[PDB]
Nucleic acid binder design. Structure first.
Ligand SMILES: [Mg+2]
Ligand SMILES: [Mg+2]
Ligand SMILES: [Mg+2]
Ligand SMILES: [Mg+2]
Ligand SMILES: [Mg+2]
Ligand SMILES: [Mg+2]
Ligand SMILES: [Mg+2]
Ligand SMILES: [Mg+2]
Ligand SMILES: [Mg+2]
Ligand SMILES: [Mg+2]
Ligand SMILES: [Mg+2]
Ligand SMILES: [Mg+2]
Ligand SMILES: [Mg+2]
Ligand SMILES: [Mg+2]
Ligand SMILES: [Mg+2]
Ligand SMILES: [Mg+2]
Ligand SMILES: [Mg+2]
Ligand SMILES: [Mg+2]
Ligand SMILES: [Mg+2]
Ligand SMILES: [Mg+2]
Ligand SMILES: [Mg+2]
Ligand SMILES: [Mg+2]
Ligand SMILES: [Mg+2]
Ligand SMILES: [Mg+2]
Ligand SMILES: [Mg+2]
Ligand SMILES: [Mg+2]
Ligand SMILES: [Mg+2]
Ligand SMILES: [Mg+2]
Ligand SMILES: [Mg+2]
Ligand SMILES: [Mg+2]
Ligand SMILES: [Mg+2]
Ligand SMILES: [Mg+2]
Ligand SMILES: [Mg+2]
Ligand SMILES: [Mg+2]
Ligand SMILES: [Mg+2]
Ligand SMILES: [Mg+2]
Ligand SMILES: [Mg+2]
Ligand SMILES: [Mg+2]
Ligand SMILES: [Mg+2]
Ligand SMILES: [Mg+2]
Ligand SMILES: [Mg+2]
Ligand SMILES: [Mg+2]
Ligand SMILES: [Mg+2]
Ligand SMILES: [Mg+2]
Ligand SMILES: [Mg+2]
Ligand SMILES: [Mg+2]
Ligand SMILES: [Mg+2]
Ligand SMILES: [Mg+2]
Ligand SMILES: [Mg+2]
Ligand SMILES: [Mg+2]
Ligand SMILES: [Mg+2]
Ligand SMILES: [Mg+2]
Ligand SMILES: [Mg+2]
Ligand SMILES: [Mg+2]
Ligand SMILES: [Mg+2]
Ligand SMILES: [Mg+2]
Ligand SMILES: [Zn+2]
Lengths: 59, 122, 127, 50, 84, 103
RNA sequence: CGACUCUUAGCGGUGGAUCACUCGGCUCGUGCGUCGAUGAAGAACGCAGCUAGCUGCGAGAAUUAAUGUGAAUUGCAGGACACAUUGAUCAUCGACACUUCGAACGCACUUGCGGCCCCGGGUUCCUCCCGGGGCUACGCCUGUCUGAGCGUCGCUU
RNA sequence: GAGCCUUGAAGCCUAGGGCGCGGGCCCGGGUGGAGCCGCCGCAGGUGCAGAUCUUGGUGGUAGUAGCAAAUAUUCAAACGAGAACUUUGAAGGCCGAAGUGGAGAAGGGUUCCAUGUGAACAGCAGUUGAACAUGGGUCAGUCGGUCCUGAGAGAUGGGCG
RNA sequence: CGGCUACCCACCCGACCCGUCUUGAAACACGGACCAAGGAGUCUAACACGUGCGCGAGUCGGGGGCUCGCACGAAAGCCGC
RNA sequence: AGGCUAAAUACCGGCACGAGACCGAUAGUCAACAAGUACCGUAAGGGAAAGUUGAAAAGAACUUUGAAGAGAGAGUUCAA
RNA sequence: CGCGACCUCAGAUCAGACGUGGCGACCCGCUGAAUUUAAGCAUAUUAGUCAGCGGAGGAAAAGAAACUAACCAGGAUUCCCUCAGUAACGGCGAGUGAACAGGGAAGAGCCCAGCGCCGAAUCCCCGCCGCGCGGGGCGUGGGAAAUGUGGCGUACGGAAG
């Protein structure tokens, strides 16, 4: 997820839980060389990323 | 005729948040679809949905400020954002009452010797 | 002769204010005269151009008595387009030719609620 | 440097954004007189100076 | 060896981006700015150079607040609401 | 520097004078402003005459001009007392009073 | 006879002079007199469907609301086309909103470290636990509260 | 000057005709495409051959000097219109561990990677590149900053101004 | 047939490369490779002389004021105790 | 040895306006154009060059040579 | 020993309010040279200017004589023409240099401390009550300031009783 630079891991986790109703294991954020923030959010083992991607745009 | 600000002023603030939530959800869906190379016809609705979100937020803030001003009307020590915002110069100036207020000596002088209308020719 | 000390006669200033005029002034600048039988009917001399009204070219290369209709009013270029006043490209495709609205005379107007108001206002001001 | 601070990286981000060619859809714009970008900075020729 | 061989030793830096002006006049060692003097509450302007004020005075920027005061002064700083 | 024959000159242009030179290019505009101000004041005070306050008879002090007579600022308190009108009412009547002048 | 060189004319090339044009300057005059602690000037970052700069804007970000005008913007598809609903653009702009630094104000600024009160989720509670909101700089004016004086005084142990 | 002009103004060129001693000017012809000039007075930022004059452009030199610091290249094939400089294989060599190796700090800021073209850049060339265009790439409780003081800088109390 | 010339060529004679410092320059004295554009005695105050004009033992309204608001009028006209 | 007060006065900055016996792209403000921009120096600071197609792009379809740059025909415009 | 009052004082994230900085063409306060001239240079001139610092307003400063004159006296202040390149200053050299008249533009004058009288008749704050559009002032009651001195009445042109 490309998120705002002002958001931290807790805010990213809360936003994901509130928007997609899925559990979060951890979040790894990094500032891209262009100025944006990219976050790898790992889902809980009970959830599958394929169905979340099919539900929200990306396939 | 998608979203007009004149009809939103009649609805209560409880419906405005509900009408803004799904609007933000649609904006997010459009943003996710924009990343995909397809659906070029939907790439133009981002502007109008953003403008409608701005309109809803504007009506919400207008109603909030109107309610706050109606509450603080006629009360001493109103909030600073509710106080006038003309400029820093006129805020420190004397009020009209203090400007029109004159001392008793000058009042008595003007009452005793007023400015008489006159003319000089015969 | 000019007498108001608040309006200028400077050529450069007039050209600047004409070339950088807002869109609501460009519609007043792009005005076209009306036909003779319609001028006596509406008691008005000129009228701005819109998209729906018909018009007839009086001067230029594509001039004649063939009645035409406007399809685009290009305010940015102070020009209008007619569906029959066109030209062929190198490959043979058609493209509209631009003619200034001052060089064209109107024969038909779209009877709109605002157009009738403008017409009656101009008539009452001409008195 | 291999490691920098957020302010310097944010300053470099705008230079990266600006170092872009001219789009080809403005050449046909009415009244356009721009033919090429005169602000293209090369990483080797012109140093931006921190 | 005072020229080309000595120029290769330039590795450090004595000036970074300022905090108030954003220019590269801020000194790291003296902790002051070379264009405005950031620790000083007053901005250092000088009449000796006429071109310094030309790049720093008002009107040479955005004027996010000064743009609207000249527009609202023409109406006498109104506070009411347009009719209807 | 001097020539065959000529009047010795001492021009006072040794100072930096070019940075302070008052050109009277606004003289017609100033006269127009003064005329408009006079007309506006007279129109606002129309029942009263221009230069309303009456001025007394004043002789010139110096021996060079003491043969002629001129106008002045105001009438003296002694003159007001001989006239019989109060001091403070003369101002609103239209009589300029000069308390500093003696008789 | 040829080649080379030199002098003229025609054509061609480099070259961008003269001429003509000018949304630009310079000068003169007139009208007004307006910044900020209710956050000034200036700076940083970001914002457009496709967008690098200027311009215009502030997470409501190439503009919001209202008024006037009345059928568009335009480089290209789309899009509200609807106007006997609310109606595009443009201008005006009095109503909302206005990120960070910056007199810059919680300390310093390496975006760190805090301290109080309140509201939602965590062992349903403090105890150096997440999110959000408000306050937390200097000097000084009037008044209130707190309290120090072998400075002066009265009654008392 | 009831002046000349889109039936062609200014400007430019000309082995053409001609005037004035001269500064200069008139006409013809060829380009050119929108203004210009005579007479009477007025006011100039008014006449260039130079100033190691300022700016811009162009010649002889001259297709000349120069593409020579550090031992060295060769054969076959493929992709390609184009091969000595690219790629693969083989042979012959250098750096030989204080390297022509593998990693870092300062500094650079996208130069890293993939794809694609080959006018510009690479001092010859190029199918190649750190060039160009597009798209990606940097994931930390236990790597470092953040904590602590060192030489040192610094506000308040106070002093000076 | 006639034609000077801003076309070319040849012979006869004369013919040193321009500018300024200098008694002396073509100098083995200095500047100039060439071409196009820009480039240098201006303006203000004061003084002296001469000339033109108007008035004349007088002369001068440049300083202000007056008429009507004026593109030409930041002009021009007038003050008369 | 205490104090207040408009007037005629000044204004190269600011917000608007009008005018010119001024300049006409090596001139005029450094800047008529993405100009205090590119660029230079660590910094104070220094600081440019650069206008003109055509009335309307109507910006040369198509055939051929060349891998392309480019060119030969053809085509629009009164005029390439 | 304690209590209370006064008086010099300290603290608060106490309630309310104010200043910081920027522009700076014009204006006000301070100190502030040298290049130049003097055909040299010290006094002088440049100049009580440039640079430097501190402040405000559309204007600021000035402004109601501890004034000018020495006769038939005038009468705030500001600006213009004259006075005047004059009186005067100066290695009396270079140079510097006003003021009073007078005529014009405009012309607005006053207050207070003190001396005395008025039972402090004065002022700020708090809260309920009666009022008007966009919100602040009039009448009521207590908490402070103030007798080491509120306010009317008074201002050298006299005033008070
Ligand atoms: Mg002009
Ligand atoms: Mg065009
Ligand atoms: Mg640099
Ligand atoms: Mg001589
Ligand atoms: Mg030629
Ligand atoms: Mg709107
Ligand atoms: Mg600080
Ligand atoms: Mg918070
Ligand atoms: Mg022709
Ligand atoms: Mg033309
Ligand atoms: Mg000249
Ligand atoms: Mg020359
Ligand atoms: Mg030379
Ligand atoms: Mg050039
Ligand atoms: Mg050469
Ligand atoms: Mg050779
Ligand atoms: Mg070598
Ligand atoms: Mg092959
Ligand atoms: Mg090989
Ligand atoms: Mg070997
Ligand atoms: Mg070793
Ligand atoms: Mg090594
Ligand atoms: Mg390639
Ligand atoms: Mg090469
Ligand atoms: Mg690479
Ligand atoms: Mg690149
Ligand atoms: Mg782990
Ligand atoms: Mg650590
Ligand atoms: Mg210190
Ligand atoms: Mg102190
Ligand atoms: Mg010469
Ligand atoms: Mg000599
Ligand atoms: Mg000699
Ligand atoms: Mg010679
Ligand atoms: Mg010589
Ligand atoms: Mg020699
Ligand atoms: Mg030479
Ligand atoms: Mg010349
Ligand atoms: Mg006094
Ligand atoms: Mg005084
Ligand atoms: Mg005044
Ligand atoms: Mg001229
Ligand atoms: Mg230039
Ligand atoms: Mg082909
Ligand atoms: Mg000398
Ligand atoms: Mg000397
Ligand atoms: Mg001097
Ligand atoms: Mg002195
Ligand atoms: Mg100064
Ligand atoms: Mg200040
Ligand atoms: Mg102000
Ligand atoms: Mg007095
Ligand atoms: Mg004299
Ligand atoms: Mg002395
Ligand atoms: Mg002298
Ligand atoms: Mg002096
Ligand atoms: Zn700075």
């Amino acid at each position: 997820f490309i998120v705002d630079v002002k958001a931290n891991k807790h805010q990213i986790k809360q936003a994901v839980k509130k928007l997609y109703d899925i559990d979060v294991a951890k979040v790894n954020t990094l500032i891209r060389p262009d100025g944006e923030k990219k976050a790898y959010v790992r889902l809980a083992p009970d959830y599958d990323a394929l169905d979340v991607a099919n539900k929200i745009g990306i396939i | 005729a998608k979203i007009k600000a004149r009809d939103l002023r009649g609805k209560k603030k409880e419906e405005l948040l509900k009408q803004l939530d799904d609007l933000k959800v649609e904006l997010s869906q459009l943003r996710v679809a924009k990343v995909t190379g397809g659906a070029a016809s939907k790439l133009s609705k981002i502007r109008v949905v953003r403008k409608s979100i701005a309109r809803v937020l504007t009506v919400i803030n207008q109603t909030q400020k109107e309610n706050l001003r109606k509450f603080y009307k006629g009360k001493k020590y109103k909030p600073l954002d509710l106080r006038p915002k003309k400029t820093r110069a006129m805020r420190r100036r004397l009020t009209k009452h203090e400007e029109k207020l004159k001392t008793k000596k000058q009042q008595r002088k003007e009452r005793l010797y007023p400015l008489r209308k006159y003319a000089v020719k015969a | 002769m000019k007498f108001n000390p608040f309006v200028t006669s400077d050529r450069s200033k007039n050209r600047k204010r004409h070339f950088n005029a807002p869109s609501h002034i460009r519609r007043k600048i792009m005005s076209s005269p009306l036909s003779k039988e319609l001028r006596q009917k509406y008691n008005v001399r000129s009228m701005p151009i819109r998209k729906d009204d018909e018009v007839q070219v009086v001067r230029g290369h594509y001039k004649g008595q063939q009645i035409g209709k406007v399809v685009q009013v290009y305010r940015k270029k102070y020009v209008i387009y007619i569906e029959r006043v066109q030209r062929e490209k190198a490959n043979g495709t058609t493209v509209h030719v631009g003619i200034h609205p001052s060089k064209v005379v109107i024969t038909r107007l779209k009877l709109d609620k605002d157009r009738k108001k403008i017409l009656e206002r101009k008539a009452k001001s001409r008195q | 440097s291999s490691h920098k601070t957020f302010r310097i990286k944010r300053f470099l981000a705008k230079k990266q954004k600006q170092n872009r060619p001219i789009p080809q859809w403005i050449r046909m714009k009415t009244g356009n007189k721009i033919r090429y970008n005169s602000k293209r900075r090369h990483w080797r020729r012109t140093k931006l100076g921190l | 060896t005072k020229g080309t061989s000595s120029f290769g030793k330039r590795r450090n830096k004595t000036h970074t981006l300022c905090r108030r002006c954003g220019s590269k006049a801020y000194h790291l060692q003296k902790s002051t700015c070379g264009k405005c003097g950031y620790p000083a509450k007053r901005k250092r302007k000088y009449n000796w150079s006429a071109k310094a004020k030309r790049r720093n005075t008002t009107g040479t920027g955005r004027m996010r607040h000064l743009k609207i005061v000249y527009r609202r002064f023409r109406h006498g700083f109104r506070e009411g609401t347009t009719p209807k | 520097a001097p020539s065959r024959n000529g009047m010795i000159l001492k021009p006072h242009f040794h100072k930096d004078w070019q940075q302070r030179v008052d050109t009277w290019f606004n003289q017609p505009a100033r006269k127009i402003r003064r005329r408009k101000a006079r007309q506006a004041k007279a129109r606002r005070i129309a029942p009263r005459p221009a230069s309303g306050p009456i001025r007394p008879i004043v002789r010139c002090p110096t021996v060079r001009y003491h043969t002629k007579v001129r106008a002045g600022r105001g009438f003296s308190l002694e003159e007001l007392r001989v006239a019989g009108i109060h001091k403070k009412v003369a101002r609103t009547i239209g009589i300029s009073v000069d308390p500093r002048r003696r008789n």
